[PDB]
Amino acid sequence: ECDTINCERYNGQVCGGPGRGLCFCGKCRCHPGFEGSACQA
Numbered sequence: 001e002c003d004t005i006n007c008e009r010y011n012g013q014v015c016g017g018p019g020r021g022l023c024f025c026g027k028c029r030c031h032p033g034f035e036g037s038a039c040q041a
Contacts, residue, residue: 016040
């Protein structure tokens, strides 16, 4: 909705689950200490 991009799913959720990282306007605002394919690791 904000950009020509959309939540990056790491497995079965989206962005390594919001608990670790949230997907957003063409991005994903994760917390310090996360990476993975999105924000799971």
